[PDB]
Paper text:
FluPol is a heterotrimer composed of PB1 (polymerase basic protein 1), PB2 (polymerase basic protein 2), and PA (polymerase acidic protein), which replicates and transcribes the viral RNA in the nucleus of infected host cells. Initiation of viral mRNA synthesis requires a direct association of FluPol with the host RNA polymerase II (RNAP II), in particular the repetitive C-terminal domain (CTD) of the major RNAP II subunit, to enable “cap-snatching” whereby 5’-capped oligomers derived from nascent RNAP II transcripts are pirated to prime viral transcription. FluPol binds specifically to S5 phosphorylated CTD (CTD pS5) and it was proposed that it targets RNAP II for cap-snatching in the paused elongation state, of which CTD pS5 is the hallmark modification.
To reconfirm that sites 1B and 2B could be occupied simultaneously, we re-crystallised full promoter-bound FluPolB with the CTD peptide in the original P3221 crystal form, but this time with a capped primer and at lower pH. Under these conditions, the extremity of the vRNA 3’ end is in the RNA synthesis active site. Site 2B, which extends across the PA-PB2 interface, is unique to FluPolB and distinct from site 2A for FluPolA, which is again exclusive to the PA subunit. Three repeats (designated repeats a, b and c) of the CTD peptide (i.e. Y1aS2aP3aT4apS5aP6aS7a-Y1bS2bP3bT4bpS5bP6bS7b-Y1cS2cP3cT4cpS5cP6c) are visible in site 2B in both structures, including two well-defined phosphoserines (in bold). Unexpectedly, the CTD peptides bound in site 1AB and site 2B are orientated such that they cannot be linked by the shortest path, as this would be between both N-termini, which are ~ 17 Å apart, whereas the straight-line distance between the C-ter of site 1AB and N-ter of site 2B is ~ 36 (44) Å.
Residue numbers in the entry:
A (entry chain YYY): 31 to 47
B (entry chain XXX): 21 to 27
C (entry chain BBB): 0 to 749
D (entry chain AAA): 238 to 337
E (entry chain AAA): 388 to 723
F (entry chain CCC): 0 to 485, 496 to 741
Amino acid sequence: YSPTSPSYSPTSPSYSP
Amino acid sequence: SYSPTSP
Amino acid sequence: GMNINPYFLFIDVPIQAAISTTFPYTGVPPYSHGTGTGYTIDTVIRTHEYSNKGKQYISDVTGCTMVDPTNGPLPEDNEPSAYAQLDCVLEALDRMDEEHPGLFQAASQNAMETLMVTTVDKLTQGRQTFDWTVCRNQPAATALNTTITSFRLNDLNGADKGGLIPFCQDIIDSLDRPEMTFFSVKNIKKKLPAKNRKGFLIKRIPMKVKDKITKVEYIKRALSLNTMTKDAERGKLKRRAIATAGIQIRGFVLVVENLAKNICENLEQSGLPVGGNEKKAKLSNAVAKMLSNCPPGGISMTVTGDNTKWNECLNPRIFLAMTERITRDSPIWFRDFCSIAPVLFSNKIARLGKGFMITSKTKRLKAQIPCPDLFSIPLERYNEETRAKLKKLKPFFNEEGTASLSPGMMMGMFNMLSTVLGVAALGIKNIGNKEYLWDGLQSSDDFALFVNAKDEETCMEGINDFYRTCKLLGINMSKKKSYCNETGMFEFTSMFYRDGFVSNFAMELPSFGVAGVNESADMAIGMTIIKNNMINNGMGPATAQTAIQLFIADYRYTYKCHRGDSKVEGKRMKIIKELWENTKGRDGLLVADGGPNIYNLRNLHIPEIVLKYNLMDPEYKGRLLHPQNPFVGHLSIEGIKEADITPAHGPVKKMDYDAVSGTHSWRTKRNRSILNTDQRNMILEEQCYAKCCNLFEACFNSASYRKPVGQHSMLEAMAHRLRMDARLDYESGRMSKDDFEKAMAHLGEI
Amino acid sequence: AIERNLARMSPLVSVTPKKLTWEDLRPIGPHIYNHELPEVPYNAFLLMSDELGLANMTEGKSKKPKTLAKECLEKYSTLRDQTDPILIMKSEKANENFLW
Amino acid sequence: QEEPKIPNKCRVAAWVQTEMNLLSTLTSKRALDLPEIGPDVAPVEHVGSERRKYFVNEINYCKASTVMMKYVLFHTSLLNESNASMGKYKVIPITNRVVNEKGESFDMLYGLAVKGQSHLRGDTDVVTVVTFEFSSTDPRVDSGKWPKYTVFRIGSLFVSGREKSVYLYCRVNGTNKIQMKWGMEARRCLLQSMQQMEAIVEQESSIQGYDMTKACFKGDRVNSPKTFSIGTQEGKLVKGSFGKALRVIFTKCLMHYVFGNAQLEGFSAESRRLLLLIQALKDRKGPWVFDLEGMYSGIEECISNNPWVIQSAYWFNEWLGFEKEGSKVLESVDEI
Amino acid sequence: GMTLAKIELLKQLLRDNEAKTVLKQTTVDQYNIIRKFNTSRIEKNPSLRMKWAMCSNFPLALTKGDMANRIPLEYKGIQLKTNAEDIGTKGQMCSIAAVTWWNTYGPIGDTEGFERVYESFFLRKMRLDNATWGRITFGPVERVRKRVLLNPLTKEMPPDEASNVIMEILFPKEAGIPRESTWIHRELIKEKREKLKGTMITPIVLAYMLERELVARRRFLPVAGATSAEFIEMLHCLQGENWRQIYHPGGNKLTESRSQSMIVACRKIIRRSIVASNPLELAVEIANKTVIDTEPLKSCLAAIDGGDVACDIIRAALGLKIRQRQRFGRLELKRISGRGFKNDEEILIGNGTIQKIGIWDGEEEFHVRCGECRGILKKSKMKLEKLLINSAKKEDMRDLIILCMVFSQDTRMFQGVRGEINFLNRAGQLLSPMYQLQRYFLNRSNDLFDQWGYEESPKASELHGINESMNASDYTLKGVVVTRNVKVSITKNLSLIKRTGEVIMGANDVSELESQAQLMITYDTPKMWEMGTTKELVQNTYQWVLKNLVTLKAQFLLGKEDMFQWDAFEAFESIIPQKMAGQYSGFARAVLKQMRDQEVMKTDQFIKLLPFCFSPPKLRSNGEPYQFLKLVLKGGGENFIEVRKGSPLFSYNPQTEVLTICGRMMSLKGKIEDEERNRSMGNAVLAGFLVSGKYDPDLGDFKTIEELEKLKPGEKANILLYQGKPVKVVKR
RNA sequence: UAUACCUCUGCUUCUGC
RNA sequence: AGUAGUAACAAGAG
RNA sequence: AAUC
Ligand SMILES: *O=P([O])([O])OP([O])(=O)O[C][C]1O[C]([N+]2=[C]N([C])C3=C2N=C([N])[N]C3=O)[C]([O])[C]1[O]
């Protein structure tokens, strides 16, 4: 992935029910 | 490559 | 039509975040034209305007008109005031000794011990200094030499001993001499044989003449200050005057400043003498503590402050009192030493620059009016502005064309000691056990006062007390420029705070260009400025990479050294184009020889010559780095590594770079204007010393590296060395019987 | 001593502070809106927005400035060979003849 | 001793606004002579390269960029003659190399200039330069703009299709060693503008955790383009791109040079004090002042006959009015 | 025959009257004054003067020599040089074209031993050449301004010591009084001479280049997790404010530097793991995937024999033998018996000041070492008792006694401090009080011995004492003797226990010091942001709240309180003072419930407090939660979250709907209710407190946190939110 | 006076801490 | 004229 | 686990 792509960012902590 | 635009 | 407004950025981004865009540092700084006499006389008048209600007396020494504001009547208005009460200073100083235990005697010791070790040559490392002998500004190194040679005639050889103490002992003694003789070179004709029609030629030889001056004249010259105007001073509409000091005073200032510097380092609430990241690191912690210590459920307020008429108010007699308090435990010889510098400033004399130029517009003529001939002309011919000034100057004006300026600190020089007096005010912290607590920071004239109290109504009452406290020390807070706000953001010495000191790229922007040392040096400096700005002043890699582009541009046009393949026409470019064709390893060629620019973000720290060395041709690298090339010359330890830089704030500090010594590391021709003036004679004087020094360095190679020590003769040293060298070379068998006897014969004559 | 001095000092000496409110910030430069004064003139060294360059497509090589200025005018010969002065605007202290 | 000549007082002029609005605008012509660089290895350099492809070209393809490159290249050659050919009168051309969208080197000529005798000893010593400059602008339109200029009709051109009349603006001007040097170092207008906006790209790149350059200018999958308050429309605010907001600052940084003097410095300095006091009210940090009218006299005595100062004074008063309206939203918060 | 020439050139000079007098009257001291003499004024605009000077015909100045005459007067119709001599050089002036000519067609000089002379620079390139680059990460970076070494040295020395070493290499005969320093660096001098043997380069250049690779270049720079010189030289490419880049510098790295980073790595892991339920499970997870430059933490802990408490704890957790080997500069100890406990004491010293020092309690034994010499040491709380040592060098035995006395923290040692010592830095920073006292008594040791005491020597088989002079004497130092002869398991909550149930180390035994690494610590785990600093974690956490504010705010308003205890907010807890962490949760959980139940919601305040509600709550005696004005966090006076107001860490702008988290601005436009813009903060500012009317002058002045806590339900009160916003609040 | 349509000069007619 | 802006340059000297 |  290229630094300009949004998919470059790390799989961040997401909230779930 | 980039090419700028305006109104 | 859509009407663009640039300020509308401030709607989206806050002022501090984008403060860089409020600094026009792509533009030209203000310069001064013609005379600075009108600017100096203004200062002379304004200095006495704030001290006019003090005590006026006539100096029995000089015979001048003196003014003493100290322990004068207290002000009844917000106009600047030099009327500082001695007790209120001594109390604030006492309060500092209580808060910081045994700092004064500790600082005094360190300075006193340093003074003993300090050599006379310490007075060489200075800028343009006033030379009393010729009554013109000259380099410190020369201005010192002229005084030593002059003192030898009047019989004062304390300089020869090596220490600064005996040389300073000579300076105060030189006032007691009834007449002070000094050399004044005067031309003489001399026939010399030649191949002319009349086989000879006339060569005007210099001859030194013994010229004397009276006791009074020398005393004044010793207390004289030479005035100019501040050029290239940013963020200022109208101009202002500055002054240079003599070689006499400069000796004693160095110690007193070093003394205050020792105090300032240890003081918490001082921006000096710390700098760069160290400065930020301190102010950040100071701000964090001054923030988080405040009473809960109250208000912490930061006064973004500044003092107007700093130098014009502060009196030397207060600075004298400061040293006497600081040197209380130190011995009696040191007390009297530190007391001189202020005593000299207390009875200082101001030189009023060049003068005023008068012109007839119809006739189309002009002529400078020297300062001694200011009242030769009826004052109707001077314009309103100057006419008013010259009348106000009259009661302070001397016949020789100078002004008695007993009050104020025209030149300044006392920055560290002037900071301390400011800190002393910040040390008080409260008056009348009221419900507030103040504490600030000090960088000479610049200050930032924090106030923690119940409510803002109390805070302002607390600030009002600081203002009235500072008036008794001689510190006048600028009601105009100074402003207040709740803690979180403030300004202190062009550094902008907003929950942390914000990046301000525009302040360091002028430094990015070609510094103007030479091709090999400027390249290193150029990249070293770029890499250091990425670190400290937050320049992103995109802007950083562009800063490399924009450098090579300015570099290639300045040194007319465009790429070899590029067909840009020029005298040099013609030989560059041949080198490009001749050379195989063209990537090995430097940018100054029309080679390619291979620099990027990573390799800024590596010299250009080192980066390309492996890529160079074997012939080219030989030429570029020829050991005995004619371009480089006799390199001085400072000449290789260090070079001057002028940032738009503080004094001119010399930064150091990393560059390889090659053909490009050249020097420029000397200013040849001297050839047409009578100063010519100094050229011979220089080349004479040059021979001696260059021959001394041939005998002692370490002289270039580490300063030679010895109170004995410079010839005596050279004799004994060359004697041994010859003897050992003979016994070893490097020297023959033919040469040894000739050597011992020549040395026999000496 | 400081206590004794701040006591005997005149109350007239003070910072005389006031809290800043938006409607205190009067607009800077009252005179710049007055029409009695003359409109500020263009005083830049060169022309900026009003400028007009004569396009001369190069042979991808660098030439001498005189030669360039020549060839650029060789193309626009109608303007280069205009010897008749048709004055439009004149500066107060300037010479139509000398300039042309 | 003759009375000193003081800068006379002027009023606001639309041509300064018009200059701003036009110099900001985009064109099809790249001027900047940005040289080669070392090859990219470190991923920082690869990001640095991409970031430029957006940042540089946004300037390069604008009017101000060419005007800047003209001043530089002229002041470069003008200083070279001034030292080399001191005694000689020389005809210096106003050269500029430009590249179009298709990629063809179009050498431009904006007019001819004449440098007088240049025996420049002191730095401030003046060398009179006489400028003859081409223009499509009829000087009769805005008469009060050109008191200093002398104009002749010298033909016509069909650049668009309408017979646009070519004029010749002739003026006796003057420069010195300092201004000519500071002119050669006017490329650094890029850096002051590019850093300020790369900072905002980094700031936003932190939050989303990827290079937000591409996203800030035009926008991507997740993120829409950045927009800034940029100008007015008959007394009602308008928003504009990051690309425009970049160029508006770059233009300002060029104007800082083109109208750079003691009047600008003095104003810029004293006007910050007021800009901060305004930010205090915007942050609601209850700011206090000791003498406002005195602090104003400092700002107002710097406004005389500098076009940029006089227009900045107007723009400041315009912006102050808009921020003064926004305040009304806050004063009615937490008071039920 | 150089000697003959110099004498004959001295003869020619002395025939001149002026030169004769100068050489007689000028001293060797004064040489430094006549050298700096010239007509040349200082150029206070060199940038201009150069650009101008370059447009002249002959700007440069050649040095009068045969090599100057090798240049032709003109080339292909180009004036290279002029006949007219320069005032300075006394040689032909020339154009820049002359330089370009020389480099093209000039004579080819001798570049033999150039790479050996300019070694320091070539190494700097060699490090970048052999280096490997990692990956760029975008996200906040807290930068500390620490005094670091700019360039790596060959062998470090003070200015004086290096200057003499340089003299011995280049200028032997001038050197002067031979110091011991010569014999210490004798091996370097010999080596440098052989390398700088066959070189034509000027000595002054060699001296300069040597001075670089000996004298230290230490200055303050903003850094973040890299203090090693070979990193600092690349600091521009390492990290910015809002980005970071991994970089492995090539060549060699030091063992000490690896050991330094190895500690901070463990200390960071433990400090974070402590808060999580089953710390060991989390410590083991991270520890495995933690990397120091390139070498993993396990490989480092296995390879290096040494460290601190924190290193051993992790060593055990990974499954490695624990080296209980404490180091105090030159002194290297190893625990035999006993266990001490650190306690901050207000220790008074000899010069007359007080300093906070962490004193160690209980009786202990250690196996000391210092170079060639070894020994065993025993001590108690602020006293030395017994010190056994072997015979080796006189200086190694001399230094070992000084270190052990300072280590013991004996009240006789602190009484010996009679001079000047700096516990505070120049920039108002803190310097390790114990590591400062060690440096003081190492140089000035005359006070230490005198101020300690003396008594008779031991009378045994091989036990014979030594005096101040370090010789077998009768009067030995009070409690000093010389002689002739020389598995564990870890708990859930990170504690090392023997087979007997005896604990030797715990999580409360590691240092609370947060300090920068020398090498670069890289965590090869998707949850690496958790090991970050206070301002890094504070910012990163609040970003996660905003990243899921839609789903979080929704399920909370429905009822479900399952987010309160969410993975994200665990890392945030480890930068809360683990002492009021529960009380904060108590307050926050109450104020949050008071917003969704009462229906006086404020989304900005929701985002502000939700991270504080992970810690299991702790209420007051009477059921009510604790009340607060601001919530304090680890390190710095900057770090706090003002509840009533905005803070340096967290601030909200209603006007623009802009949220500023540690300088970085986010927008809350399209995530706020229309009615919410009106809703006062007074309702969601104190737990079990809601707004009634407006400030009543009758009720009196605003009440403190204490005065608000101790009020019976249904009592009216006055609170000030932020300057000029009075409120009338009543207790529910 | 004159040589002098010649000769020299471009930060050295005051640039501080 | 013009540069420029509180005072200069628009050449100086033998 | 710092000082220089
Ligand atoms: O780094 P610390 O904050 O833990 O403090 P310091 O300077 O003492 O660290 C040096 C090392 O020495 C150990 N030490 C110090 N003393 C005087 C004692 C000990 N350890 C024990 N068991 N007993 C002592 O009396 C510190 O633990 C540290 O490792």
